[PDB]
């Protein structure tokens, strides 16, 4: 098979001239040794198909037309180059970016002209078969004759090419009659999984049923995708199994089930580099930025500057403080929105969701267990930890759940005694909720209480209760009209990048500039508002501090300030008045 050698010597040349990949292999060889010096990376080198055409078209057309004869000599060549690297103290994997395609196909259009040829499928992935080990290298120890003894197991998906099947069990006294004990943990196991892929629901032609084909995901690729995710798989299209023709009478016509091996799995729908962080740093000094930011949330939504301000102040959230040998005070801020429909309350929340960096959305009922583990024989709020939970139609939700939400929100933990596993597990999530007024449109005129409909402590738990009115005016109307019109005919993405660095860097602590302000304010609130309106408690005070610290994060300031205190004052005022 000197031609397989030719493929290797040919793919050799491609690397190191040009050398643009070799630096990445070196990077892989170095990073792991750096982990060796410490006190994880899959070994595979993504090959852009882009570059392959510049050198040889003959070898380019081959990878697409007949990948079985080509990918493995190229692979053996990649290992061969990884061993000439540095130094001592594995098969790897190819990837194939592309430069698609031909071979571009959705799963609906495929079979057989596209079989035994590289393929990039795309569609929804369900139901994602459960992750499981797969044996490859057999390793044994002989005694007292010693040495070291190994067998090599060839499965159906071994390499690419078909080979005389090795399986199964263990060699167990290979000649001469010496005993062989299985050596576990020297022997190699590559993980293995399969996931079926349905064509995109929106490009479905008719009431004709969906056609899905299965993709086996080797090695690292495993557990890279939850089911229901947009996926563009790549891989060689393989037909495995006899069609029944192997066994002699299997009489049925049905046969040759097909699947795709490998390979990449690019998902479809943070890194701050050098320049971005500089942009932030420059932008932090400007005094008015908060208002611009607060406007950046709402391309499609009028006014509500105060509410947008709020959502930012939730995205940041008052650090977290865990006292020595004592309970921790709640860091994050929770928000509610109440008003007549068309208030965008349900529209706002999706935009909360997108840029939120997590978390799970929940709408009314909803449930079961909401955040709970349910103690499965034989949830959200937990899985949403360090994130933004959305709740829609927050009123509709059964009181049974609310009882638990009390425990989630302030206390900050979830407790499960159910049968069972008995544990206190932590859900520290931030929370938004939008909830319709009691009955009809009556919210606006109706009393400060009896309007909310969901007493009582809940009303308190939420740091901010914002009320919005749909009441109509002609002027405001016109001003609605134009923007609505233009809509149908500084960057927003920069907003989350702006946010993460702000979140882990750096926590502003607290300063004696401010305290007297929030104390004055607080005492004012209790004393005067308890005549004006309700509810007010120490909780409000806590919230004051969280808001202060959050606006400090917006300012990037290593310290809390008086101005910030005044801001918190302002928004909590518009909350109240």
């Amino acid at each position: 098979d000197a031609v397989f050698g030719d493929r290797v010597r040919r793919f050799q040349e491609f690397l190191d001239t040009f050398t643009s990949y070799r630096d990445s292999v070196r990077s892989i060889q170095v990073y792991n040794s750096n982990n060796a010096a410490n006190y994880i990376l899959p070994h595979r080198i993504i090959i852009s198909l882009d570059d392959l055409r510049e050198f040889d078209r003959s070898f380019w057309s081959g990878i697409l037309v007949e990948p079985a004869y080509f990918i493995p000599p190229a692979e053996k060549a990649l290992t061969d180059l990884a061993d000439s690297m540095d130094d001592v103290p594995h098969p790897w994997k190819l990837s194939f970016k592309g430069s698609f395609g031909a071979h571009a196909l959705s799963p609906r259009t495929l079979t057989a002209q596209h079989l035994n040829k590289l393929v990039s499928v795309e569609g929804i992935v369900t139901k994602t078969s459960l992750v499981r080990p797969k044996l490859i290298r057999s390793v044994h120890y002989a005694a007292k004759t010693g040495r070291f003894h190994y067998r090599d197991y060839t499965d159906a998906t071994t390499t690419l090419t078909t080979r005389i099947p090795t399986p199964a069990i263990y060699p167990t006294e290979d000649t001469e009659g010496n005993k062989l004990t299985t050596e576990y943990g020297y022997s190699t196991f590559i993980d293995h999984q399969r996931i079926t892929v349905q064509e995109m629901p929106e490009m479905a032609p008719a009431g004709q049923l969906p056609r899905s084909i299965d993709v086996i995901l080797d090695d690292d690729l495993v557990d890279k995708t939850k089911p229901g995710d947009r996926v563009n798989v790549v891989g060689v299209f393989k037909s495995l199994g006899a069609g029944g023709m192997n066994q002699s009478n299997s009489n049925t016509l049905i046969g040759f089930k097909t699947l795709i091996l490998g390979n990449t799995v690019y998902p479809l729908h943070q890194m701050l580099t050098d320049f971005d962080i500089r942009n932030i740093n420059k932008l932090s000094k400007k005094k008015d930025i908060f208002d611009i930011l607060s406007q950046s949330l709402a391309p499609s939504i009028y006014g509500h500057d105060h509410i947008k301000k709020a959502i930012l102040l939730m995205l940041m959230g008052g650090v977290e403080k865990n006292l020595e040998n004592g309970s921790h005070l709640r860091g994050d801020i929770n928000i509610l929105m109440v008003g007549d429909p068309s208030t965008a309350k349900s529209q706002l929340l999706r935009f909360v969701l997108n840029t939120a960096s997590l978390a799970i959305a929940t709408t009314g009922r909803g449930s079961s267990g909401v955040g709970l583990t349910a103690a499965v024989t034989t949830g959200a709020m937990v899985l949403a930890d360090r994130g933004v939970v959305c709740i829609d139609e927050f009123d509709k939700m059964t009181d049974v759940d609310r009882v638990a939400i009390h425990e989630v929100m302030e206390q900050q933990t979830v407790t499960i005694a159910k049968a069972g596993i008995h544990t206190t597990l932590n859900a520290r999530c931030s929370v938004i909720a939008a909830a319709n007024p009691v009955f009809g449109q009556y919210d606006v005129n109706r009393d400060p209480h009896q309007n909310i409909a969901l007493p009582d402590s809940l009303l308190s738990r939420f740091d901010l209760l914002f009320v919005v009115t749909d009441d109509i005016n002609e002027i405001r109307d016109r001003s609605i009209s134009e923007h609505v019109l233009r809509t149908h005919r500084v960057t927003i993405p920069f907003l989350r990048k702006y946010v993460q660095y702000a979140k882990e860097r750096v926590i502003p602590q607290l300063t004696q500039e401010a305290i007297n302000v929030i104390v004055k304010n607080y005492t004012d609130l209790r004393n005067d508002d308890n005549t004006k309106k309700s509810p007010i408690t120490a909780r409000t005070l806590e919230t004051l501090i969280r808001l202060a610290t959050a606006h400090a994060k917006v300012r990037l300031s290593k310290t809390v300030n008086k101005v910030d205190a005044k801001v918190a004052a302002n928004l909590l005022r518009f909350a109240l008045l």
Binding site: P167, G326, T423
Partner: protein
């Protein structure tokens, strides 16, 4: 180590991580598709307690720093949930 484990209890269980093949089947996998299990070795459970202790040997010493200052009652009192005012 038997019976050490009880249902519903979070535990750090340590052990050699091993396959026990295959009993067959053997046609289906193909292969060999080990499916494994964890051999238990040691068991450490989270959250293991008065009133049960015998001694009261040199531990009384650990009590005495608290006693000697006197006015134990107010001291401990304040020492429950200092986190609030």
């Amino acid at each position: 180590l038997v019976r050490s484990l009880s249902p519903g209890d979070i535990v750090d269980v340590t052990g050699i991580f091993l396959p026990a093949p295959y009993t067959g089947f053997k046609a289906l996998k193909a292969g060999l598709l080990t499916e494994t299990y964890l051999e238990a070795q040691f068991v450490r459970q989270h959250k293991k307690k008065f009133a049960s202790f015998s001694l009261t040997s040199d531990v009384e010493e650990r009590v005495m720093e608290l006693i000697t200052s006197g006015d134990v009652y107010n001291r401990l009192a304040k020492s429950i949930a200092p986190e609030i005012y």
